[PDB]
Amino acid sequence: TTATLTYPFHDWSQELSPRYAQLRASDAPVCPVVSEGTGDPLWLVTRYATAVKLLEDSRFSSEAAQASGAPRQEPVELRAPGTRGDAIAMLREAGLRSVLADGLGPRAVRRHQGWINDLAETLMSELASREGTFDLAADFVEPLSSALVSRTLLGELSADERDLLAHCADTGLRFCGVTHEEQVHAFTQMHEFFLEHARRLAGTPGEHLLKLIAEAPVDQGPLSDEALAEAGSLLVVAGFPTSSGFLCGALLTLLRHPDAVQELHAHPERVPSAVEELLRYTPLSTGSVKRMATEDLEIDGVRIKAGEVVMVSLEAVNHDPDAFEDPDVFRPGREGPMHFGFGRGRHFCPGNRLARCVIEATVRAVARRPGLRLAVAPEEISWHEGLFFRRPRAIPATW
Numbered sequence: 001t002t003a004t005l006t007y008p009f010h011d012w013s014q015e016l017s018p019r020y021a022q023l024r025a026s027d028a029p030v031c032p033v034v035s036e037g038t039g040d041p042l043w044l045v046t047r048y049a050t051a052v053k054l055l056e057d058s059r060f061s062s063e064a065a066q067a068s069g070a071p072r073q074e075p076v077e078l079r080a081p082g083t084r085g086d087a088i089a090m091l092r093e094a095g096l097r098s099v100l101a102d103g104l105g106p107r108a109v110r111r112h113q114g115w116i117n118d119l120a121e122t123l124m125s126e127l128a129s130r131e132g133t134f135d136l137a138a139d140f141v142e143p144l145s146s147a148l149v150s151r152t153l154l155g156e157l158s159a160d161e162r163d164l165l166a167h168c169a170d171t172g173l174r175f176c177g178v179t180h181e182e183q184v185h186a187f188t189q190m191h192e193f194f195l196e197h198a199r200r201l202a203g204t205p206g207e208h209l210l211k212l213i214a215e216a217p218v219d220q221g222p223l224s225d226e227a228l229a230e231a232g233s234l235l236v237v238a239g240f241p242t243s244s245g246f247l248c249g250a251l252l253t254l255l256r257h258p259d260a261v262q263e264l265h266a267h268p269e270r271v272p273s274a275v276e277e278l279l280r281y282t283p284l285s286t287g288s289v290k291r292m293a294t295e296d297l298e299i300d301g302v303r304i305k306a307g308e309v310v311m312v313s314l315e316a317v318n319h320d321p322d323a324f325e326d327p328d329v330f331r332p333g334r335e336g337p338m339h340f341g342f343g344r345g346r347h348f349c350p351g352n353r354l355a356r357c358v359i360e361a362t363v364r365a366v367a368r369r370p371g372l373r374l375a376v377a378p379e380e381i382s383w384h385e386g387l388f389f390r391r392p393r394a395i396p397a398t399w
């Protein structure tokens with residue numbers, strides 16, 4: 001341990017590291033840190049106003065910060081050895097410029113919102129018939145996110161396939177708790193799974209994104225097997241632990257705020273505003289979005305050299321009191337500036353409409369059912385240690 005902070009801050013539960021607020025209030029708008037996993041130098045931004053400037057500046061490149069050899073917070077590269085790890089660009093190069101936005105945008109959500117809301121209701125109606133303590137993680141979030149992944153993303157996976165992909169995601173998308181080789185092997189297993197099965201999965205009936213990608217028109221040649229497999233890996237890493245982690249976290253927020261839930265029960269028209277406040281208030285990533293300077297530049301007076309990587313903690317910015325009065329209060333009626341739960345600028349979450357859809361269905365399922373409560377104190381919830389995307393092991397609950 002030295003005088004420069006190592007990153008990340010080990011805040012694996014919903015309790016955000018106090019270090020973020022300390023850095024926000026310091027005199028440095030951009031703070032040098034060192035990656036615990038690699039020893040690489042990095043910059044860290046925690047103020048909302050600085051983050052807006054960073055994430056809207058085209059001279060900072062997200063893709064450059066994903067390339068092999070970039071200074072990085074993650075201990076192992078987020079790609080199988082020998083692969084590009086460049087899924088969005090490979091789809092763009094094949095001529096599939098829009099298929100991601102097409103399969104996740106408003107028209108796609110209109111196709112899926114019915115069964116998603118019906119399934120949220122079916123799952124919660126089943127819990128309403130249960131005795132004693134039930135687990136919202138295993139018996140609500142798991143089946144709902146599994147259906148999302150199968151029906152909207154990958155196709156009809158078997159339970160063995162789903163468990164394999166979920167294990168790969170949890171093992172690879174981690175700062176600690178597993179060996180280096182275990183993490184590299186997780187990325188290899190996932191890629192080889194999609195080299196073997198992506199064509200078959202894209203051919204199963206439905207409208208899942210993997211099928212849309214495999215069946216889409218292309219400029220020049222047919223989409224390569226490597227590219228389709230890279231698409232499968234992207235959909236897993238971007239859609240699976242994010243959705244499962246966020247839905248678990250959002251449930252915990254709701255259970256810890258019964259007054260807010262009672263309000264949503266009385267005023268269902270307020271549910272969309274509650275979804276937005278959950279995206280601000282509920283922490284998800286334990287790391288940061290990041291961008292590489294493509295040329296020497298200045299941000300809030302701090303000189304960044306070409307090739308250096310600047311991180312923004314979305315959690316830190318979402319809890320910035322310069323942007324959100326009483327930032328650590330869950331306040332669905334809040335009328336603050338735009339939150340950072342989906343990022344900002346060019347790379348704003350392309351799945352944001354689908355995520356909002358599933359979050360809303362979950363909030364409505366809870367709000368319609370008075371009496372749901374956490375069965376244990378929030379400090380007794382057990383958290384998976386080191387995941388990029390926070391997730392509790394279980395959410396014990398009763399009526």
Ligand code: HEM
Nearest residue numbers: 235238239242243246289290341342343347349350351355
């Ligand atoms: C509540 C759930 C989710 C949250 C909170 C979330 C959040 C985010 C955020 C903050 C980013 C920006 C990363 C950056 O700026 O570097 C992002 C990007 C992305 N998200 Fe979402 N996401 C969620 C669900 C999903 C789902 C279900 C999909 C389905 C495919 C998805 C697909 C993507 C992709 C492909 C990107 C990368 C965009 C790029 O790098 O240009 N996300 N997400």
Ligand SMILES: O=C1N[C@@H](Cc2c[nH]c3ccccc23)C(=O)N2CCC[C@@H]12
Nearest residue numbers: 062065066078087088173234237238388
């Ligand atoms: O599409 C990308 N975008 C960014 C951010 C990101 C979005 N979702 C992620 C999930 C895990 C890690 C990073 C991200 C990224 O770092 N990428 C590495 C793997 C996917 C690729």
Ligand SMILES: O=C1N[C@@H](Cc2c[nH]c3ccccc23)C(=O)N2CCC[C@@H]12
Nearest residue numbers: 074242284285286287288289290314388
């Ligand atoms: O934890 C991470 N977060 C994403 C960005 C992100 C922040 N919040 C998110 C929410 C959903 C998806 C991506 C993000 C990322 O780029 N990473 C590189 C290595 C660690 C990993």
